[PDB]
Design a protein around this nucleic acid. Structure first.
Lengths: 56, 86, 329, 64, 231, 34, 493, 59
RNA sequence: UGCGAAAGCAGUUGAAGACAAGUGGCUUGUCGUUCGUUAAAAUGGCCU
């Protein structure tokens, strides 16, 4: 009756390349810059910069 | 320690740099005024440059460089610049 | 006193149109009464002394007719933001009331004249005036389908008017002050209420006899009736709401209010209700949260107690808790 | 995180940022946010990055 | 009707500004609160009211940007080394400007500020500047969103007041001029859409103790333009 | 965890668990006022 | 970004006999006054109501002292023989004094010239006189007649009740603090009798056998009373007639007791006890009457008191000695135009909707070593350590912060003879203590590692190294002999 | 500095309006002033804590 | 580096190629080069 799942997130996982200095931050702001779209190694998190919560 | 550049007509400041840590006893320039060198009791010689075409068309000195060569002070500084001597 | 100069619901109570002053010029805005289905753009009256004297929702491009004080009925669509058409009489007299039945707009003038316009043709059909009715400030079309016979006009004293003969066929004892609400309840009754008194009276439009008197406990500002005569909710001068439940039954000649609703904040500050709307089992009350911005509330009015005190959350001394900082700063 | 005023060569600092700055950039149209990646290298057994933008006005960590 | 008659003030009303578009009046004084009133003829009511503790205010201004005209900031400041900026959202998100980016010695109090518009002049991108009147002759101009020190303009004497003039150039380009007066009466005009460099220096005929300069007849900081072509 | 589940930590830190008219007016107004 | 963490002062493991909160509070009773009386101070009472004056009964006079100047405000000298007891009424309005001729005389307080009434009690000396603590118009006087009397001060001719029954020398009364019908009296045969006054009164309802002759009986709760006499004091539950604590922490006989409640103190209640050998001690009734603080005086202490529960000012502990002197230890406690211009600065946001608060709190001032460690001036931080006016834990914590934080060697690089002598001259003193000596060890080791040539050149730190050598020789003899004591009691397990 | 010290000077003519403010205008000790951008409307704040409000009927 | 206990106990430190300097070679030293082995320094320091 036991089942395995992965339920909680992981590391943010930026560009793990050499030979790229500066822009290794792949997270984006919106154009109506109210929510901040960051990838993770398990998902895309979309936080909201007004309330600091993850909204999607 | 501050070094200021003043427009002569209108008799007024263009830009101030907070360069040295104590007094600036002596400062000098080259022929075409692309550089201003300056020194004092904190024993560093600062160089303020305006050599870029944008610097010359905008009248904007930058605090380019800074050297520590003297042991105690610098009370006198001067510059010579010719065809085989600068 | 209230900043909202004029205000009215659409039928079904889904939007509220309201005229308020904005730094010496009138502005007309429309708000949805429930967001779960801001609206930051207004119609601006461009003159400092032109102002709206009455307003009526038409029923289907949705629009408002705004009766102005220069002999004009502006017709203003709300999805767009322009007056689509400007009805005008031949005069400069302010117009005291308008109404419409279908496509047939009727209006009264400060020179006690009756004008008829056609919303389908954009034309002044009729202009007349009748004797011994000389201080008119309300009209109401008595509905008989597409026939728009029998206006019902008030001057402190309601008079029933046949428009084919342009004459008065009944005369009702009105009030001692100018009538401020004059509304048809059923096909045989109409309610009326005057300026600065707390007494409505329902008259029988076929005999002239007063059926009943309804007694608010403060001076009545607006009224709404549910569409089947079963409930009448009036809103008063002290910002309260009073619901007369089933007023047209056998508290025999004069009936008090059955329910009374007022709104207080969490503090103890009593905000005033202006201009509510009632329907079957549903009651939508309006107030102003900040200085001029209307907030609404839906209520199942049949299952609340009699003396109901709505509580709203309103900023009174709350520490500005910023979301990017814990409580210790 | 230092920011050099390139006119007068004048630093403004932000000193205790719980990780070394391995990437920093201005972000807004007017440049009202700084986004930073902080590598947090007290543990040598994992590369654990903190993503921290912050509004440029009062330099407070909006959305770490 | 007296505008603050609805909600009384607990101090002398030190500054006062209307909104550029909305029917709002912002009052503020030494009782470290600032109040917004929806004004009309009859019933000037109070929209909202924010009490900044420990920060008496001396100048308070509605700023509204030229790009989208949708920000609606309130910048307020008194005899403090900081200046608050409330972002109007109808809780309240305010930020605090407290960093002169290397220039704290020449700016010991944020009392006399003015807010103005500035154009990048290589893009057609405008942004608001706040302008702080400092000790020696200094005006410290800094960004109204990021707070970065942009430039500084020093006049020779005791700086007493200043004002902002704008002049159009072409379609969609204008130029900002800072007009700053000595106590003695001599006036500097700085072009500051480029680097903050003097373009004109003149002298007031008569006048020995000079307290206040103002411009008018076009867009001042108190009659602000909502759209860049209306400058 | 103390309610009959077992949490585990992956080496790339994913925590896992082993357990047991008016309508169009409304739409166009929410469009045109946003 | 955060704020900078403060430099944490190095605290070691705590040593035995730390300063308890009770003994910190009772140790700030200082600035002792010694007033030489004509004879032994036998009794001392306090004014209850404005609890700010106290009456001291010496021989043949009673002096009321003030609790703000500690001088005699008023004095009562018209007694014929030795006055024995002097207490204030519960309203603090009048003062009763029992005298060696058995003449209770009650004056009003703060007026020594109006003797209000002179009860002529027994022909024997009257040794204790106190009013009721609940009732106002009854006064209980016990005498050397082995019978106490309750007198109504209206009818001062015959005693309204005559509590007999004790076999020898009744020296103390007490009243029970909730039941006003209940008088506990104590005599030199032991045997605290106690009487219900609605009954006959010639028989106690029960008797508590303190074995020694009692000197005082006070009432702590409405239930429990404490009797002192002999070398101990005992406490007695009164609803169950039964002893429940006894403390015998003295050498000679406990002469007096009194009790405090609810006053501003870590101790919620306090019983202090005075005991003919010099000592007055304070016992805490909430943890089993354990002793918390004490004073030693210059002779046998005959009576003691403290300021009452509601003192609201300068608070006093007074002890009168049998030597004939009195010891007091106290603990103490622009234009209208301009204001109209600067009116609003005291408003603090009452009627205002939103109230913003981001004024940061002003923290404690940084010391020079802490700001130099902050500014990364590590040699200047060492210099700021070795100033003379520095605390020993502060020198230790800046040494430990430079040790953990960066480099001892960085802090010691540019030194020579004249700038190392502060460090080594402190290391002489720090090598003695246990808490410093590890840090002193590695700092001395590093400085002799990197200044071994200055050792050769300068002779005036050679002698400092030699003195340090003899210091470590003494300390290593101590650290060896401590291990020997450790073994020699490891043998005794 | 003194009470009721406010003048509205018309310009280009550079001539002070002589009918307002009168001796009975409750201006107070005028410590701030503001003009409306659209309504033609003065707000005048004095040291007592009162913004008084006037409308210029030319606008 | 491995086993360990926080003590300690066993193991070390090759090769190729390229480049730089010095005097095509020779010497020395490097490597954002590879294979194998379990294997100190540019006056340059922390916000309001």
């Amino acid at each position: 009756q036991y089942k395995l799942s992965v339920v909680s997130g992981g590391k943010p996982a930026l560009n793990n390349l050499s030979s790229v200095t500066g822009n290794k931050n792949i997270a984006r702001l919106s154009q109506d810059q109210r929510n901040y779209i960051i990838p993770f190694n398990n998902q895309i998190k979309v936080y909201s910069v007004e309330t600091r919560q993850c909204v999607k | 320690g501050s070094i200021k550049f003043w427009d002569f007509q209108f008799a007024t400041l263009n830009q101030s740099f907070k360069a040295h840590d104590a007094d600036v006893l002596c400062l000098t320039t080259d022929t075409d005024n692309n550089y201003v060198f300056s020194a004092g009791v904190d024993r560093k010689i600062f160089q303020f440059s305006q050599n870029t075409n944008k610097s010359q068309k905008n009248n904007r000195w930058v605090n380019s460089s800074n050297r520590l060569l003297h042991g105690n002070d610098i009370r006198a500084i001067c510059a010579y610049q010719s065809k085989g001597a600068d | 006193d209230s900043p909202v100069l004029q205000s009215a619901y659409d039928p079904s109570g889904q939007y509220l149109c309201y005229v308020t002053v904005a730094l010496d010029k009138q502005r007309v805005g429309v708000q949805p009464t429930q967001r779960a289905t801001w609206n930051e753009n207004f119609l601006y009256l461009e003159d400092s002394k032109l102002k709206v004297t009455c307003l009526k929702w038409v029923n289907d491009t949705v629009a408002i007719i705004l009766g102005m004080n220069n002999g004009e009925i502006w017709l203003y669509s709300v999805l767009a933001n322009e007056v689509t058409y400007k009805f005008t009489t031949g005069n400069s007299y302010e117009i005291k009331d308008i109404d419409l039945m279908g496509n047939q707009l009727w209006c009264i003038d400060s020179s006690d004249a009756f004008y008829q316009f056609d919303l389908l043709q954009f034309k002044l059909l009729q202009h007349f005036r009748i004797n011994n009715c000389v201080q008119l400030n309300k009209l109401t079309i008595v509905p008989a389908g597409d026939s728009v016979a029998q206006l019902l006009v008030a001057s402190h004293s309601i008079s029933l008017i046949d428009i084919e003969e342009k004459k008065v066929v009944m005369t009702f004892p009105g009030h001692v002050s100018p009538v401020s609400t004059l509304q048809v309840i059923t096909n045989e009754f109409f309610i009326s209420g005057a300026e600065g008194d707390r007494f409505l009276n329902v008259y029988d439009i076929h005999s002239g006899m007063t059926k009943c008197v309804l007694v608010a406990e403060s001076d009545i500002k607006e009224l709404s009736h549910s569409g089947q005569a079963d409930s009448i909710a009036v809103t008063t001068e002290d910002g309260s709401l009073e619901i007369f439940v089933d007023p047209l039954v056998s508290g025999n000649k004069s009936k008090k209010s059955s329910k009374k609703i007022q709104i207080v904040s969490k503090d103890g500050r009593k905000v005033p209700i202006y201009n509510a709307f009632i329907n079957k089992d549903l009651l939508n009350v309006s107030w102003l949260q900040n200085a001029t911005m209307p907030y609404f509330k839906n209520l199942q009015w049949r299952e609340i107690p009699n003396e109901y005190t709505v509580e709203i959350s309103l900023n009174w001394n709350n520490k500005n808790k910023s979301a990017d900082r814990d409580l210790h700063g | 995180m230092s920011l050099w005023q390139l006119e007068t060569n004048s630093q403004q600092f932000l000193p205790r940022l719980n990780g070394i700055i391995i990437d920093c950039q201005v972000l807004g149209p007017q440049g009202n946010y700084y986004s930073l990646i902080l590598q947090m290298t007290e543990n040598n057994s994992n590369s654990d990055y903190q993503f921290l933008l912050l509004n440029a006005s009062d330099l407070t960590s909006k959305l770490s | 009707k007296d505008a603050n008659a609805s909600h009384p003030s607990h101090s002398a009303i030190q500054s006062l500004s209307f909104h550029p578009s909305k029917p709002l009046l912002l009052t503020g004084g030494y009782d470290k609160t600032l109040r917004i009133y929806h004004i009309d003829g009859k019933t000037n009511h109070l929209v909202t009211s924010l009490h900044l503790v420990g920060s008496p205010i001396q100048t308070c201004t509605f700023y509204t940007s030229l790009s989208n005209q949708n920000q609606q900031n309130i910048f307020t400041a008194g005899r403090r080394r900081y200046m608050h900026s409330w972002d109007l959202s109808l809780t309240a998100k305010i930020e605090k400007f407290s960093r002169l980016y290397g220039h704290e010695s020449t700016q010991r109090s944020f009392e006399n500020f003015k807010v103005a518009h500035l154009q990048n002049s290589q893009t057609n991108s405008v942004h608001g500047i706040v302008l702080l009147q400092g000790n020696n002759g200094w005006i410290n101009i800094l960004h109204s969103t990021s707070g970065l020190w942009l430039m500084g303009c020093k006049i020779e004497g005791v700086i007493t007041d200043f004002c902002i003039d704008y002049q159009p150039i072409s379609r969609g380009k204008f130029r900002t001029i800072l007009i700053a007066v000595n106590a003695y009466g001599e006036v500097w005009e700085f072009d500051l859409n480029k680097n903050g460099h003097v373009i004109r220096r003149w002298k007031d005929q008569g006048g020995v103790g000079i307290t206040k300069i103002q411009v008018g007849g076009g867009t001042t900081t108190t009659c602000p333009a909502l759209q860049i072509s209306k400058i | 965890n103390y309610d009959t589940d077992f949490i585990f930590l992956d080496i790339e830190s994913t925590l896992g668990v082993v357990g047991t008219n008016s309508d169009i007016f409304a739409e166009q107004l929410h469009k045109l006022s946003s | 970004s955060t704020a900078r963490p403060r430099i944490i002062t190095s605290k070691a493991p705590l040593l035995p006999q730390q300063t308890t909160p009770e003994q910190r509070y009772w140790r700030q009773y200082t600035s002792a006054q010694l007033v030489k009386e004509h004879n032994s101070v036998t009794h001392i009472s306090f004014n209850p109501q404005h609890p700010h004056d106290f009456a001291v009964t010496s021989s043949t006079r009673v002096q009321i002292f003030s609790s703000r100047t500690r001088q005699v405000i008023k004095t009562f000298s018209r007694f014929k023989d030795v006055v024995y007891s002097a207490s204030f009424r519960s309203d603090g309005k009048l003062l009763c004094a029992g005298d060696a001729t058995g003449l209770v005389s009650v004056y009003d307080s703060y007026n020594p010239r109006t003797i209000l009434l002179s009860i002529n009690a027994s022909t024997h000396p009257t040794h204790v006189t106190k009013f009721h603590t609940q009732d106002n118009k009854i006064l209980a006087t016990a005498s050397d007649d082995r019978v106490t009397r309750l007198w109504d001060i209206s009818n001062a001719y015959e005693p309204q009740l005559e509590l007999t029954g004790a076999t020898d020398y009744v020296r103390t009364l007490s009243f029970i603090p909730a039941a006003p019908h209940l008088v506990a009296t104590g005599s030199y045969d032991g045997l605290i009798r106690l009487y219900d006054t609605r009954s006959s009164g010639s028989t106690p309802i029960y008797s508590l056998n303190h074995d020694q002759p009692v000197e005082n009986v006070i009432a702590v709760s409405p239930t429990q009373i404490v009797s002192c006499g002999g070398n101990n004091f005992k406490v007695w539950d009164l609803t169950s007639n039964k002893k429940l604590y006894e403390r015998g922490n003295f050498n000679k006989a406990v002469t007096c007791l009194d009790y405090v409640e609810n006053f501003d103190s870590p101790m919620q209640s306090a019983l202090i006890a005075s005991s003919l050998d010099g000592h007055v001690k304070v016992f805490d009734p909430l943890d089993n009457f354990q002793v918390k603080f004490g004073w030693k005086f210059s002779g046998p202490v005959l009576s003691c008191a403290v300021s009452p529960s509601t003192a609201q000012g300068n608070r006093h502990l007074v002890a009168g000695l049998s030597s004939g002197l009195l010891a007091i230890r106290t603990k103490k406690k622009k234009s209208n135009n301009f204001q109209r211009m600067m009116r609003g600065s005291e408003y603090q946001g009452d009627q205002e909707h939103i109230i913003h608060n981001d004024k940061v709190r002003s923290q404690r001032r940084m010391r020079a070593f802490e700001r130099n460690i902050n500014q990364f001036k590590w040699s200047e931080a060492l210099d700021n350590a070795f100033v003379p006016g520095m605390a020993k834990e502060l020198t230790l914590t800046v040494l430990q912060e430079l040790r953990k934080r960066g480099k001892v060697r960085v802090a010691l690089y540019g030194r020579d003879e004249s700038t190392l002598e502060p460090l080594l001259n402190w290391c002489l003193k720090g090598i003695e203590d246990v808490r410093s000596a590890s840090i002193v060890a590695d700092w001395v080791a590093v400085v002799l590692e990197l200044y071994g040539n200055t050792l050769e050149s300068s002779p005036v730190l050679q002698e400092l190294m030699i003195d340090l050598k003899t210091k470590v020789r003494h300390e290593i003899h101590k650290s060896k002999e401590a291990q020997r004591i450790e073994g020699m009691l490891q043998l005794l397990t | 500095a003194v009470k009721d010290a406010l003048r509205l000077v018309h310009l280009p003519s550079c001539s002070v309006f002589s009918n307002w403010p009168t001796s009975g205008t409750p201006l107070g000790k005028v410590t701030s002033v503001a003009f409306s951008p659209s309504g033609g409307l003065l707000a005048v704040g004095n040291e007592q804590g009162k913004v008084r409000l006037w409308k210029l009927n030319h606008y």
